[PDB]
């Protein structure tokens, strides 16, 4: 209609005029910063989302996607005055949405959830690569007007027609090659991760269609959780079951974040902010020009455990790291530091390794028995029914700062320990068992 034209005025006011927590123009500051990096993204604060849903709960859970299309064109003018001529590069912006107060697993979906906002977790299985998508279907007749404008193609429906506004004949529609830009497309299928699930049962499947500036953020194997919309595509054709009055499932996404840890928070440490813009970076210099910081940081690092000092000197030094200093056409230099603890059975040695898993950025916790001699490093998973022998790594290629527990699994100590002591010596080790001779890089 026409009152939605005023809606853009009614929120650009309601967003940009004030940001909470004693002003400071928080949301008015993170706009220009992500303009500086030229990375095409924005955020919304949950407390702002709590306040910008009072007139918009019946415009979020009622209509999630066409509200966003008119929400998209105001963000250009929200920064066109700030950065002039920014539309001359890449001509496009689209928003992303932060966390949400739902805890839905994969099982709990019904009819009431569709065409609305959803949030779910899982794990990423087998995935494809990156293709280009047409995204603007300049339709083509043969004898009449063969330019029907760049269209707006949907998901897996193949939106076309036979004849409209030119004739009524069976002349098919074709293509040509003038000025059709492309966004990309990457169909990760999702499996439910076996965490919060009543066990002893099967996994369940979905499909996820990513979008333009959200390609290959995830890696295969790693735990993710996705926030997006729900959609349907009644294709009227399915060939595992019989054809029936049913319809498939497609989850398009608006945002994606990494695995989270210690899920007990109320207002922080679930959203990966990690965005040290103004209140942090202006502050973080005077905390660095004091005289006893290294006598203060390592004392205050692991707060729950009083103990002897020297381990907390070492284990804080381990995740701080050194430098992979390259050199000229000669041998490289290890840029890693690898501690080893030794403890009595009953001191706090199992906890500092547990606590440092949270305080790192990425980690892994392959411990004890059941650690395969190959499953730590890369392994080849065999092909499905028409595929090729591909390379699907496990622990060590994912983890850049990984944590193992090699205590005394003696029956498998003669198996795996010939595959970890060359991750250090001949660092960046990879293998060619019945496949391709390659060399991945894992520092």
């Amino acid at each position: 209609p026409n009152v939605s034209r005023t809606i853009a005025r009614e929120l650009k006011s309601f967003l940009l005029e004030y940001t909470d927590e004693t002003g400071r123009s928080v949301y008015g500051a993170r706009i220009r910063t992500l303009g500086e990096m030229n990375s095409e993204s924005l955020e919304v604060n949950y407390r702002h989302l709590a306040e910008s849903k009072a007139i918009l709960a019946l415009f979020l859970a009622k209509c999630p996607e066409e509200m966003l299309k008119i929400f998209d064109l105001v963000a250009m003018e929200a920064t066109e005055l700030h950065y002039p001529d920014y539309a001359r590069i890449h001509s496009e912006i689209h928003v992303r949405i932060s966390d949400f107060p739902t805890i839905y697993s994969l099982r709990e979906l019904r009819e009431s959830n569709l065409s609305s906002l959803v949030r779910v977790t899982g794990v990423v299985t087998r995935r494809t690569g990156v293709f280009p998508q047409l995204k603007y279907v300049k339709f083509n007749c043969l004898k009449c007007g063969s330019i029907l404008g760049p269209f707006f193609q949907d998901s897996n429906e193949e939106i076309r027609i036979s004849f409209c506004t030119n004739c009524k004949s069976k002349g098919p529609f074709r293509v040509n090659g003038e000025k059709t830009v492309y966004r990309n497309y990457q169909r990760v299928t999702l499996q439910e991760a076996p965490g919060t699930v009543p066990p002893g049962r099967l996994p369940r499947h979905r499909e996820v269609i990513l979008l333009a500036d959200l390609v290959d953020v995830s890696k295969p194997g790693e735990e993710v959780e996705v926030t997006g919309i729900y959609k349907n595509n009644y294709d009227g054709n399915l060939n595992a079951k019989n054809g029936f009055p049913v319809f498939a499932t497609i989850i398009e996404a608006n945002s994606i974040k990494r695995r989270e840890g210690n899920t007990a928070n109320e207002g922080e440490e679930g959203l990966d902010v990690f965005s040290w813009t103004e209140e942090e970076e202006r502050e973080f210099r005077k905390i660095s020009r004091d005289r006893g910081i290294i006598d203060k940081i390592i004392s205050s690092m692991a707060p729950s455990i009083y103990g002897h000092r020297d381990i907390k000197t070492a284990v804080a030094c381990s995740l701080f790291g050194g430098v992979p200093k390259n050199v000229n056409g000669k041998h490289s230099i290890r840029g890693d530091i690898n501690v080893l603890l030794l403890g009595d059975p009953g001191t706090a040695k199992s906890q500092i390794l547990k606590y440092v898993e949270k305080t790192a950025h990425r980690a892994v916790f392959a411990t004890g028995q059941g650690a395969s001699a190959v499953g730590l490093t890369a392994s080849v998973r065999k092909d499905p029914i028409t595929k090729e022998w591909t390379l699907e790594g496990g622990a060590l290629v994912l983890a850049d700062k990984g944590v193992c527990l090699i205590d005394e699994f003696d029956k498998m100590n003669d198996q795996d320990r010939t595959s970890i002591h060359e991750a250090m010596e001949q660092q960046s080790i990879s293998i060619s068992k019945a496949g391709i001779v390659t060399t991945l890089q894992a520092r």
């Binding site: 009644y234 009055p245 049913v246 692991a302 009953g346 892994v364 916790f365 028995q369 059941g370």
Partner: protein, 614 residues
């Protein structure tokens, strides 16, 4: 003439909803139960009904209830019209369903020939290999875009993916359609397979099966792998010719008769299937009774006498299993370590004695607690190990008696006969509450919140007396220090104890000598601890200063030298020294810790550590 008969059963059922079937007045059984069925529905908004076969049979005396048993393949879109009329006159987006239940008889799957087309037949069996939750259609807003696509046909059939009848103007009928995702409301369903029960098969003679469809809210109520009953409407469904994909022995030989319909000549089959509507799965003052029973005095001593009739005496170990029967606390420090959540107690003793009776007792007494011998230490189970590539993927998770003991009390025995590798695996599972796996797949973050129970065997079957159990533990050192203490059951052959135990066993092994009186019953004890778990007592007094000197005295005892053994009871046990100490006060429903309550806490290790220390 069935229209008015359908209209006759419309109002006669509606008039039945006007009355009740209530036989007693104000002795319980409040009248007009169907009016209250509407009243509960207009608060919680569940969109169901629930009618029984009894009270509709006993109104028209079978003159009407016998008619719907052979016709409600057609009468089901009739009774919905009448209740849709009575709801506006009796109550203020409205889709419903008809849920009969509890027919008298129950059949098996081998008795479905000819009367079972359009009937109602309760069917037993078990269920295997479920599927996912997809949407269904039943009503379209789709129409062709010739002039106006607002034609709303209804009732999409088993293949009618094309509503192409009666447009508004004289536009191009049957030219196109556009399935609107806006107005066409949906419903959610799943398709599972069933199987025949074990106590009916003659031999191993390939026990056949069939398939069902769950339509309403009945999704996800059918937990797979249990004995179950169903509603009973029958159906037949073909699907061979559509718009998309191109549509042994002489199966489908009846199909050649079924040819030559008005559209293209094909070979349409008909396969038997089944539809359900409702599932079931077989297999105050009482809330004031807890308030009376919480105001007793010696319930700590009343409960310990009323644990198990199959045991006599052993009043030390009876105290411990009750604390294991309840739970402790689990909330702990912030941003880091999650501490212990429970206790873990074992008892070693001579086999074929009273050790095996508690193990029989707990697995029915406890919620969802499994029992496993723990001897299959090769494939899976106790040891966690994934399955090989089968039907579309390797690296899938597996079962075993730790993951399904999530807030469950598992019990494993026979520690001696396992291998040398799992003795660190469960030792990993004991110290904190998660286990980790990376066998040929990615790392898994699973957290089996468990509390184990153990009973191993001695080194010779007879326990020596003058030595310690450091020899007779028959395992390694640090898992014992990772464990709590035991109170090992002793043995003796006296002239008196065998005689009274003989009288103790014969009245039990009587078919009926129920003269023994436990001062509680089973279930009122069961709901009692369900009241006990809903507190969180915190030590608040300054007896922590009293606490610290006891351990500081205690550690100087078990260390009998600088070169004395490494069974030095360290700061690991201090957590158990308070987390049992709150749980015994959690039994007597006191929300704080006194120094008087920890008197039984100190010696309980100490009388059993002097069992260790000679």
């Amino acid at each position: 003439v069935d229209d008015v008969t359908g209209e006759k059963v419309r109002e006669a059922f509606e008039q039945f909803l006007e009355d009740f079937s209530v036989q007693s007045t104000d002795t319980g059984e409040v009248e007009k139960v169907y009016r209250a069925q509407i009243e509960f529905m207009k608060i919680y908004d569940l969109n169901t009904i629930y009618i029984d076969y009894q009270h509709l049979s006993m109104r028209e005396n079978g003159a009407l209830a016998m008619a719907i048993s052979e016709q409600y393949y057609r009468f089901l879109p009739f009774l919905q019209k009448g209740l849709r009329r009575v709801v506006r006159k009796y109550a203020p987006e409205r889709v419903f369903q008809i849920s009969f239940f509890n027919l008298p008889t129950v059949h098996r799957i081998r008795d479905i020939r000819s009367e079972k087309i359009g009937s109602l037949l309760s069917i037993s069996g078990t269920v295997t290999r479920t599927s996912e939750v997809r949407p269904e259609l039943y009503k379209a807003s789709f129409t062709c875009d010739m002039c106006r696509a607002i034609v709303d046909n209804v009732e999409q059939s088993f293949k009618y993916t094309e509503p192409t009848f009666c447009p508004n103007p004289s536009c191009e009928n049957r030219a196109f359609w556009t399935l609107n995702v806006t107005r066409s409301r949906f419903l959610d369903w799943q398709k599972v397979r069933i199987q025949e029960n074990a106590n009916e098969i003659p031999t191993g003679s390939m026990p056949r099966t069939l398939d069902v469809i769950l339509r309403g809210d009945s999704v996800e109520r059918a937990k797979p792998g249990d004995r179950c009953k169903f509603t009973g409407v029958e159906i037949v469904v073909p699907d061979v010719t559509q718009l998309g994909l191109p549509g042994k022995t002489t199966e489908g030989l009846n199909s050649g008769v079924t040819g030559l319909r008005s559209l293209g000549v094909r070979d349409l089959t008909y396969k038997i299937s089944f539809l359900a509507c409702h599932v079931i799965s077989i297999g105050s003052d009482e809330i004031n009774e807890l308030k009376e029973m919480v105001k007793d005095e010696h319930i700590y001593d009343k409960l310990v006498r009323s644990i198990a009739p199959a045991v006599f005496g052993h009043e030390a170990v009876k105290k411990g299993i009750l604390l294991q029967m309840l739970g402790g606390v689990h909330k702990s420090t912030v941003e880091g370590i999650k501490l212990r959540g429970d206790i873990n107690i074992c008892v070693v003793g001579d086999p074929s004695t009273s050790k095996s009776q508690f193990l029989k007792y707990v697995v029915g007494f406890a919620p969802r607690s499994v029992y496993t011998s723990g001897k299959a230490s090769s494939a899976a189970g106790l040891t966690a190990a994934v399955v090989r590539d089968e039907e579309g993927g390797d690296y899938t998770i597996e079962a075993g008696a730790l993951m399904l003991a999530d807030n469950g009390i598992c019990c494993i025995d026979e520690f001696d006969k396992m291998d040398i590798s799992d003795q660190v695996a469960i030792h990993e599972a004991m110290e904190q509450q998660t286990i980790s796996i990376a066998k040929a797949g990615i790392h898994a973050t699973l957290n089996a919140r468990t509390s184990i129970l153990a009973a191993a065997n001695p080194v010779g079957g007879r326990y020596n007396r003058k030595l310690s159990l450091r020899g007779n533990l028959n395992m390694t050192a640090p898992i014992m220090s990772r464990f709590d203490l035991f109170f090992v059951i002793l043995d003796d052959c006296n002239e008196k104890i065998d005689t009274e135990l003989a009288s103790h066993i014969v009245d039990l092994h009587m078919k009926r000598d129920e003269a023994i009186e436990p001062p509680f019953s089973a279930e009122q004890l069961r709901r009692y601890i369900k009241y006990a778990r809903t507190f969180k007592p915190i030590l608040t007094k300054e007896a922590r200063s009293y606490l610290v000197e006891k351990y500081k005295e205690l550690r100087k005892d078990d260390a009998q030298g600088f070169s004395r053994s490494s069974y030095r009871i360290t700061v690991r046990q201090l957590e158990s020294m308070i987390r049992l100490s709150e749980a015994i006060a959690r039994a007597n429903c006191v929300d704080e810790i006194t120094p008087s309550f920890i008197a039984e806490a100190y010696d309980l290790l100490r009388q059993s550590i002097i069992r260790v220390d000679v």
